[PDB]
Amino acid sequence: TIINVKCTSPKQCLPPCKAQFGQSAGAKCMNGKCKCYPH
């Protein structure tokens, strides 16, 4: 679920994206917002 949240690094995108899907949710951030990829 691509999220329009703000980010400074995709690293901080995993924790938040890891509390919605689980510890498998792979997410990233293009210097601007995170991205959640359910799997």
CB neighbour list of residue 4: distance below 8 Å, 6 or more residues apart: 33
Experimental technique used? Answer: NMR
Spans of all domains in the chain: 1-39
Buried b vs exposed e over 2-38: b needs ≥16 C-beta within 10 Å?
A: ebebebeebeebbeebeeeeeeebebbbeeeebbbee
Give the alpha-carbon dihedral of 16, 37, 23, 4, to 10 degrees: 0
Top-level class of domain 1-39:
alpha beta
